[PDB]
Amino acid sequence: SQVINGEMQFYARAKLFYQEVPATEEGMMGNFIELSSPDIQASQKFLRKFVGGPGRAGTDCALDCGSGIGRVSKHVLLPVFNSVELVDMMESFLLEAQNYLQVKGDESYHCYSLQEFTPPFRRYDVIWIQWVSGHLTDKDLLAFLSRCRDGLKENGIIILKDNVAREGCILDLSDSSVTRDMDILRSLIRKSGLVVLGQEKQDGFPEQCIPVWMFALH
Amino acid sequence: SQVINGEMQFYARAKLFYQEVPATEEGMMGNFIELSSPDIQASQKFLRKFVGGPGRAGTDCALDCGSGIGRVSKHVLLPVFNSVELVDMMESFLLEAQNYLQVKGDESYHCYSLQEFTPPFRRYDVIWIQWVSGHLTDKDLLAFLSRCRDGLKENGIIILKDNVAREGCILDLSDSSVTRDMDILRSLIRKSGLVVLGQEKQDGFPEQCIPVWMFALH
Ligand SMILES: C[S@@+](CC[C@H](N)C(=O)[O-])C[C@H]1O[C@@H](n2cnc3c(N)ncnc32)[C@H](O)[C@@H]1O
Ligand SMILES: C[S@@+](CC[C@H](N)C(=O)[O-])C[C@H]1O[C@@H](n2cnc3c(N)ncnc32)[C@H](O)[C@@H]1O
């Protein structure tokens, strides 16, 4: 089994990559902007199943991790939650989030790398982690997921939505990302102290695309 | 088994790394300048076994691949060969090679990345490839070794000297290098169309250090 070292360069390259990504919906999606509508439709449906009623997540506060300009906040979180906070390492995306989300400007915008971020203690009903876990190493993802657990209000949930490789991991040096497989991802979730409440595979995506999964964790 | 993509970024990072490496012997060795003397002593001994006499390599021309400033050219090749040529992607190291090798200046200095280099046809008695194969991907190393084969004069040899992992490969993102193991390296050599004439393990190195091997190929 292969050993990969150079964490500092792994993170430094993701910053150089996102420095040239446009602060637009198309830049957030990559080469798959036509996939934003079915991505959003599936998230809204999956989310609703775990919110409202006794023992389910509340609707006061949500956290959008690796938010970018706030694509998930706009179409998924802001319609459901009274207040939504955004966390992203890129100041550029957080500034554009102000125009993209059409807010007065003007606290809800956190500029931190997730591996250096502690979600405020018991603040959130829902913590959303979409298309960003792949940018964290196995060690940093495990520690971040355990910290997200303490950021949860009573009956709060973490929603992890990402690419899940068929079998075997895929490392991409261009954007410094890892496409984990189901075995590796479930291990990290279990080790962080989280349990899977539910899971759904993203439908409506072309057969060529790597499978996309949704997990409800607590 | 893991899939690694992003060749362009893999090569782009090695250039950024060598841009900050000093054009000195200490910079060529890394954090192991005290290891240059036993490295040189072992190379001189290994080389002599495959040069001179019927059916062995001649002594007219040698090529130093990933030469740097010409550490191997200075202490190994220039005492044996009538003329020695250097190939390195870094112009900085090739310019310093002029002062380091104490030459008039002032054709013998080739500024090319090995994966974009074709050793001149049947020009060399010996082609030296030391502490650079790790910077080539498996595909580019295989193709380069097959091209080195055509750069060889009759009875010429390729001397490959590098770090060989115990079992399993080690990828280092900081300098964009791979420490191949014996199984992977021997496969690439066989696939390039080369056969092993001889092999020796580098002695006199601390127990902590990754094993260093020498191969005589043709
Ligand atoms: C593919 S975009 C996804 C944006 C958003 N989650 C969506 O679904 O539209 C990845 C985002 O993660 C952010 N990011 C990448 N690595 C990060 C890290 N280690 N810490 C924080 N943010 C990071 C990037 O700045 C970018 O906004
Ligand atoms: C560790 S230094 C070794 C220098 C020399 N072989 C020695 O033993 O002193 C690695 C050298 O390979 C060069 N190099 C790295 N990747 C290269 C590539 N793809 N093509 C050509 N030269 C490369 C660097 O510029 C540097 O001079």
| Whether the Cβ atoms of residue B143 and residue B149 lie closer than 8 Å to each other | no
Which chain B residue's Cα is nearest to A171?
A: B4
If phi > 0 it is left, if psi is from -120 to 50 it is alpha, else beta; for residue B88 that is beta
> Which residues, in sequence order, are CB contacts of B147 under 8 Å at separation 6+?
B117, B118, B119
Tell me how far apart the alpha carbons of residues B162 and B167 are, in angstroms, rounded to a whole number: 15
B118 in contact with A, Cβ within 8 Å? no
Burial B135-159 (b: 16+ CB within 10 A, else e): bbebebbbbbbebbbebbbeebbbb
CA B144-B147-B148 angle, 5° bins: 85
Residue with tokens 């950024």: B16
Closest C-alpha to B150, from B158, B138, B160: B158
- Residue whose token pair is 């979180």: A77
Ligand 2 in reach of B58 Cβ (< 6 A): no
- The answer to whether B161 and B213 have CB atoms below 8 angstroms apart is yes
Q: Which amino acid is at B116?
A: E
Contact A79, A5 (CB under 8 A): no
Would you tell me the crossing angle of helices A138-150 and A182-192 to the nearest 10 degrees? 40
* Cβ-based contacts of B2 with chain A (< 8 Å): 2, 168-171
User: Within 10 Å of residue B205's Cβ, how many Cβ atoms?
Assistant: 16
> How was it solved?
X-ray
Q: How far is residue A6's CA from residue B172's CA, in Å, rounded to a whole number?
A: 6
Specify binding-site residues of B for S-adenosyl-L-methionine. Answer: 66, 71, 88, 114-115, 130, 135
How far apart (Å, rounded) are the C-alpha atoms in residues A2 and B2? 8
Whether B3 and chain A come into contact, CB under 8 Å, resolves to yes
In the structure encoding, which two tokens stand for residue B163, read together? 């770090």
Rounded Cα distance, B110 and B57, in Å: 23
Report which of A127, A198, A123, A129 is spatially closest to residue A154, judged by C-alpha positions.
Answer: A123
DSSP calls for B4-36: EE-HHHHHHHHHHHHTSS-SSHHHHHSS-GGGH
For chain B, say whether A171 makes contact (Cβ under 8 Å): yes
Q: What is the whole-number distance in angstroms between the Cα of residue B99 and the centre of ligand 1? A: 48
A10 vs B contacts (CB less than 8 Å)? 173
What end-to-end distance do the CA atoms of chain A give, in Å?
32
Q: Which of B31, B41, B8 is nearest to B161 (CA)?
A: B41
Contact at CB, B173 and A9, closer than 8 angstroms? yes
Containing H/E element for A7?
helix A7-18
DSSP assignment letter at A59 = S
What DSSP designation does A146 have? H
Q: ∠ CA(B212), CA(B72), CA(B162), 5° rounding?
A: 20
Resolution in angstroms for this experimental structure?
Answer: 2.0
- Please name the residues between 173 and 202 in chain A that touch chain B, using a CB distance below 8 Å: 173-174
Q: How far apart are the two ends of chain B, measured CA to CA in Å?
A: 32
Amino acid letter for position A125: D
Sign of the dihedral through C-alpha A184, A188, A194, A200: negative
Q: What does the alpha-carbon distance between residue A150 and residue A119 come to, in Å, rounded to a whole number?
A: 8
- CB contact (8 A) between residue B6 and residue A169: no
Closest by CA to B145, choosing from B110, B188, B90, B184, is: B188
- β-strand pairing of A170-172 with A177-179: antiparallel
Q: Do B173 and A173 touch (CB under 8 A)?
A: yes
Phi, psi of B191 (to 5 degrees): -70, -30
Using an 8 Å Cβ cutoff, are A67 and A86 in contact?
A: yes
Check the annotation: does A130 bind a ligand: yes
Backbone angles phi and psi of B103, in degrees to 5? -115, 155
Domains and CATH numbers, chain B: 1-218 (3.40.50.150)
- The rounded distance, in Å, linking the Cα atoms of A100 and A90 is 15
B159 lines ligand 2 (CB under 6 A): no
Contact B2 A169 (CB under 8 A): yes
Query: Are residues A10 and B173, on separate chains, in Cβ contact within 8 Å?
Result: yes
Residue A129 near residue A66 (C-beta atoms within 8 A)? yes
Contacts of A160 (CB under 8 A, 6+ apart): A129, A130, A133, A189, A214, A215, A217
Phi, psi of A145 (to 5 degrees): -70, -35
Distance CA A151, CA B170 (A): 36
Mutate to test the pocket of ligand 1, among A132, A142, A163 (most ligand atoms within 8 A of CB): A132
Report strand pairing: A212-217 vs A196-201.
antiparallel
Element (H, E) at A95: helix A91-100
Ligand 1 atom nearest the C-alpha of A71 is 9
